[PDB]
Structure 1
C-alpha cells in the first residue's frame, strides 16, 4: 500500500531509512553443508514467477494451510502489492504473519508454547532453544502479536539468511551454533504431505525444546532427512520405528512415559496385595466449593500420579540437611533398642457409642514452633 519502492518499514533500526532495497538476492551461507546439495534450490523473488512464489510461501510460511479461493483475502491483499513491487518478499511474510489468516490457524487453535515453535518453523525455518523461547514468550505477555512477529523479520538472523528477496526455507548450513540446533531444526521440518493443523498439540518438540537436555529421538530425525542420505537404513530396520512413531506423533501421544518423566517403578510381583496394576497409585481427587447452593462437590478418582522427581528434588536436597551433630549423647544405653518413645494414647473422641480408641508407640521429637 505504501510506496513502489520500500526496503524496510516501521523504523526499528535507524539505518533502514537510508537502506536501499537489495538489487539482487543474497548469496547462500558460505559453509560446506553436505545435506543441501541433495536439497532443491531456493526460490527467490527474481528467478521465479508468482505461481511458485505463492506456493512456496504457502508451503513454508503457511505450513500446509490449504487456503481456498474465498479463504484468506488478507493474503490476497498482501500478495497484490508484492506483484506490484510495493513491498519486498521479506516484508510480505511480515504481512502474512500479522494477518488474521495466520492467526486463525496457528495462534488461536494451537497452544501458547506451540505458537512460538511454529513461528520458528515458518519464518526462520528452524526450532528455537529455551532462551529463544523465554525471550519470545514475554512479547506474547507484554507486547502481543505484532511485536512478536517483528522479532523474526527485523532480526539479523533473517536478513543474513534470506534478506529481502529470498522466500524462507530450511537452510542447511553444516556448521551450526549447536549440534542440537541442526537436528531440532530437522525434526521441526518434515517433508511433503505434512501440515500443522491436525496437531493442535505438537507435544514432542514442546518438551525437547523445553528442558535444555533430552535431545530428541533418532528416528524422529532420520525421517525427514533427504535421500541417498537415509537409504539402506529405511527398508525395514528403522522403518517400523518410523511407523510406530508416526502413530504416536499423529494423535499426540503425550510423552510423560518414555521421553521425560523417567521413573523406575517397582515390578508388579513386589506388591501384589495392593494389586490390579491398572489401579495402583490412584487417589480420590476431591474438591469442595461450599458457596451458596449451586456449588458442586469434586470426586473423580485421579490417575496414576507419579513422584514428580523435582518436588522431591527441591525437598530433600535444598532442605532436610538436618544432617548435623548426630552423636545424640550415647548414655551407656539399654533403651531396649529405639529410645525416647512416648506411649502416645491419643483418644479417638468419644461420640457416645460405636467409636473406640487405639494406641501406638512412636519416637517423639519436639517441633520448631515449640522452643518458643
Structure 2
C-alpha cells in the first residue's frame, strides 16, 4: 500500500530513513560449509519467478500450511504489492507473519513456548537457545504479537543472512557459534512432507532448548541431513531407530521418562508391597472446593507422581550444616 519504492518501514533505527534498497542480493557467508554443497540453491527475487517465490515462502515461512485457493486472502494482498515493488521480500515475510493466517495456525492453536520455537524455524531457519527464548517470550507478555515478529526481521542476524532479496532458508555455515546450534537447526528443519501443524507440541526441542545441557538424540540429526552424507548409515543399521523416532515424534510422546527427569528406580522383587509395578506409587489426589451447595469433592487416585529431583535441594542445602 505504502510507496512503490520502500526498503524498510516503522523507523526503529535512524539509518533507515536514508537507506536504499539493495540492487542485488547479498552473497553467501564466506566460511566453508561442506554440507551446503549438497543443498539446493538460494531462491532470490532476481533469479526466480513468482511461481517459485510463492511456493518457497509457503515451504519455509508457512511450514507446509496447505493453503487453499480462497483461504488466506491477506497474503494475496501482500503478494499483490510484492510484484508491484511496494515492499521487498524482507517486508513480504513481515506482512506474512503479522497476518491472521500466520496467527490462526501458529499462535492461537499451538502453545506459548511452542510459538517461539516455530518463529526461529520460519523466519531465521534455526532453533534458539534458552537465553534467546526468555527474551522473545517477555515480548509476548508485555508487548504482544506484532512486536515479537518485528524483532526477528529487524535483527542483525536477518539482514546479514538474507538481506532484502533472499527468501529465508536453512543456512549451513561451517563454523557455528556453538556446536549445539548446528544440531538443533537440523533437528528443527527436516525436508519434505513435514508440516508442523497437528504436531500439537514439539516436546523434544521444547525440553532440549530449555537446558544448555541435554544435547539431543543423534537419530533426530542423522535423519534430516542431506543424503550422500547418511547413506551407509540407513540400510537397516540406524534405520530402525529412525522408524521408532518418527512414530514417537508424530503422536507426540512426552519425554518425562527417558530424556528429562531420569529416576533409576528400585528393582521389582526388592519391594513386593503393593504387588505389581503398574499400580506401585499411586496415592489419591483429593481436592474440595466448599462453595455453597455445588462442590464435586471428587477424590481421584492420581498416577505415579515422581520426585521433583530439583525441588529436593532445598534438601541437603537448606539443612547442610544447619538443622
Q: Is TM more than 0.5 here? A: yes
Give the C-alpha shift of residue 294 in structure 1: 1.1
| Partner Cα separation in structure 1 for residue 319 and residue 118 of structure 2 | 40
Find the aligned partners of 2:224 and 2:110 in 1 and give their Cα distance: 23
Task: Compute the displacement of 1:274 (Å).
Answer: 2.3
2:121 aligns with 121
Q: Distance in 2 between matches of 1:106 and 1:317?
A: 42
* 2:28 maps to 1:28: yes
User: What are the superposed Cα offsets for residues 24-44 of structure 1, whole Å, 9 maximum, x if unpaired?
Assistant: 000000000010000000100
What SS class does the counterpart of residue 299 from structure 1 fall into? strand
In angstroms, what is the RMSD of aligned CA positions? 1.2
Shift in Å, 1:275: 1.7
Q: Distance in 1 between matches of 2:214 and 2:242?
A: 19
Aligned-partner Cα distance in 2 for 1:276–1:144: 50
Q: CA deviation at 1:214?
A: 0.4
Instruction: Give the TM-score, by structure 2 length.
Output: 0.98
Shift of 1:315: 2.6
Q: Distance in 2 between matches of 1:107 and 1:82?
A: 25
Deviations, residues 257-305 of structure 1 (Å, cap 9, x unaligned): 1001010100101101222111111110000001000121131111111
User: Could you say if the C-alpha distance between residues 225 and 267 of structure 1 is closer, same or farther in structure 2, counting changes exceeding 3 Å?
Assistant: same
User: Matches of residues 138-287 of structure 1 in structure 2 within 5 Å?
Assistant: 138-287=138-287
> Aligned partners of 1:298 and 1:88: how far apart in 2?
59
Give secondary structure in 2 for the equivalent of 1:285.
strand
1:3 to partner: Cα distance: 0.5
Structure 1, residues 236-263: CA drift from partner, whole Å, max 9, x if none?
0110000001111000000001001010
Counterpart in 2 of 1:84? Answer: 84
Could you give the per-residue CA deviations for residues 62-105 of structure 1, whole angstroms, max 9, x where no partner exists? 00000111110010011100011110000000000000100000
How far residue 211 of structure 1 moved from its aligned partner, in angstroms, is 1.3
Where 2:91 maps in the other structure, the secondary structure is helix
SS class of match (1:237): coil
| Structure showing greater Rg | 1
Aligned equivalents of 2:89, 2:226: Cα separation in 1: 27
SS of structure 1 residue aligned to 2:206:
coil
What is the total number of aligned residue pairs between the two structures? 322
1:8-29 residue CA offsets vs partner (Å, 9 max, x unmatched): 0000111001000000000000
CA distance in 2, matches of 1:28, 1:20: 21
Shift of 1:320: 4.0
Provide the C-alpha distance between the structure 2 equivalents of 1:318 and 1:147, rounded to a whole number of angstroms.
Answer: 42
Deviation at 1:198, TM superposition (A): 1.2
**What is the CA distance between 1:319 and its match in structure 2?**
3.4
Cα distance per residue 1:329-356 (max 9 Å; x no partner): xxxxxxxxxxxxxxxxxxxxxxxxxxxx
Unaligned runs of 5+ in 2: none
Higher relative contact order (CA 8 A, sep 6+): 2
Q: Deviations over 1:205-257 (max 9, x none)?
A: 00000111001100000000001101100110110000001111000000001
Q: TM-score, normalised by structure 1?
A: 0.85
CA–CA separation in structure 1 for the residues paired with 2:314 and 2:88: 52
Runs of 4+ in 1 over 3 A off after TM superposition: none
